[PDB]
């Protein structure tokens, strides 16, 4: 549980893909050439030039099996801070399609070389250039015009003709709705560029099951055969029709992506996963964002769900949601919560015996502010009382101290003297965030609740009013 | 304002007393033997211990007169503290009675010695030996057995027979009740000391005025002429028949037992009234009082309603009573403020500006109690804000705040967390009272929330509650 910094393997590689990147333009470019200097049936000499393209591509092709490797034990490896994880899931994506380019190009250098290796059908190939998933969708919202991007892969040479539009299709391998889910999903090509943008429109819930959409398009041969070419499936995905189903559609999402058809996983692919759909969950910048879980977090989750072991195994899962699914529910919908908690109002993941120990004697009126172990979803306000001795009290805050969404719990905190000084969470010289003592109505400070008339003077008040 | 110490004014005049006590019981005796050995028709030769004893009298009334005006002079001059005090008011009883007592001794060796001096009719007196008045009575309580003693005084030989019983009445000189106020008005004479014990019951209120009992008897001469011989009026006092008029009446009785038909009066012959009223109200201990009107209390007095002059005025006094009558209504009758003011929780007569000088920065949650000055009768809590900058708040406690006896001022103070710790007002090493600050729940030890069930631990706990 604690972020490393693979900051090598990763410019490493990212290197490399803006090289083999050019590598692969120079090289539709001298395949296409060479096949169009291919005297009318091959003989020998002829066919040096290609034998060499041929080797050329075998290596290059190799590099970038060891390059996906390389990635994927990383992410399997290594717990990835919210910069490096964002590369890492960008490297990967460009590096596969770099990789089905390059397989385009050896099978049409192939299909020469070694005939009867042919039946390969046409060289094209439908490939997701970028999109907005894993995320969980709110029915009605429609994606942006460069959100949802499908390209199509050739080699040198086009044998044929590509009939109708792009089609997209929503999938839910865990069946058996009756009409249709989506508007816009067949969309026509960009010639130079050859790609579709889908600014989809979602019409349906998804009856909190994971999804993926799948493309596909007619391809009409030099012999006027039509074959249907379609994309891997993309990323799952899940539509909610109210902030009711968010939890359970976004736990089966988070289950679906973080284990994928497996029974255990490695705790570093597990919070690799959980950190990125929780910067989504929070709507958080996925490099620089406010506040991603830090270190100390992940320990807590992984000592508090986890057998604290190195490997997670699915049931695990189960109770870890049922806690975890209503920590980010709150945060995700309670107004203010999210803003309280990025930054530093609110801790949030924090147990009793550490609260105590983080409050051990201080003046009282201290607090810090903390998700309930037994009650999730909700805070327990950790002060020092009044009375003597003093000792140290909880408070589970209630959905009736903020109830009627006209008061919110920022109100309610300015409300009780109970709660002088907060021990905020600040960062210090070196990126550090320490606890600060800062007062209840400095660190609310814009949430404060300004005064119209100025404060009274040589008269009388009422109390805490 | 300053309580000074005339402790030798009065242990000399205590001395002189106990002694004068004495001469007088061997003059009677003397007294009574010379005239026993008179032979029938005074000689002259036959006279001469008698002019012998007339000097030696009218010589010791003479220091009895310089006795009662040094005693006239201290109160109306000095500042005296409460036993001083009523020491004093013992002393000048006592020595009135021996006077009357020598005066009545004198008058019968003078109808012999210059007769025609006579017509003085017969040598007899009735004193008020110990009374309970001042004080505001309520209708229906019955004075003790020896609260109200009235003593006959005789001469060394009585010419004379007394008929009937003792009978009090009831007097009140701003005219101009139609029944009956007193039962058991009429009482029998104790003949080894002459004297009548009047357990009064007080049937009527006195509609707020102040009142005064007379007492009298018939006395029937050797010549079987009759004449009632009276004593004078005693101190003043009033019957109430609801503590609402408590106020009106304590005032009327004050300003009447403090000017008595004058206009103005010294400071000192003032608050050494208003101190023995003060005390008879908050009911303590006139010798010992656990908490008298101190310096400091005298003081504030003096600048609030008085020009601060060593001279007060008889409207002076409407004014005063108007406020002050309304804190004394208070510590008599809210349920727990005399015992809280008596033990330094609550300090009491101190303004605006002291108490903010004496709260001048100390931790919040720092309060002192004490009067309103602008709302009689009523508690301002002058403490130590949350909110930064820590400023001085203060707030006027109100009826309802402790409304339905139920609940307590002492409940609702151990009710909000703005009133930590408390600055009690306690004696120190020298007796002096000083400030220190107790724990709210400390303080109010004894008027503390005791508890049922033991605190609760490992889970969460209400709010203040």
Redesign the interface.
Known sequence: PNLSSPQPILDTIYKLLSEQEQTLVQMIHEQSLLLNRLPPTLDENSLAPLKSLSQKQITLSGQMNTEMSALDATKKGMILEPTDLAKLFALKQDLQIQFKQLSLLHNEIQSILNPQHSAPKPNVALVLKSQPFPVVISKGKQLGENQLVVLVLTGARSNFHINGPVKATMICDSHPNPTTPLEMDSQPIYPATLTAHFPLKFLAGTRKCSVNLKFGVNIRDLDNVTTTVESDASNPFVVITNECQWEGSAGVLLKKDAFDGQLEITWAQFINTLQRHFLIATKQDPVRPKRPLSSYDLKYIQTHFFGNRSIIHQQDFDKFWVWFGKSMQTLRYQRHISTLWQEGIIYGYMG?QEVNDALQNQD??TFIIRF?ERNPGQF?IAYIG???PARI????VQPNDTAAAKKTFPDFLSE???F?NLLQWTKDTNGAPRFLKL????ALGSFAPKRTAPVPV???????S
Chains 1, 2 share one sequence.
């Open positions: 009793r009282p009126g309930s327990g009044v009375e003597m009290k909880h408070y589970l009780h003297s109970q002088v007062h209840k109505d400095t040589g008269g009388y008040e009422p109390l805490n």
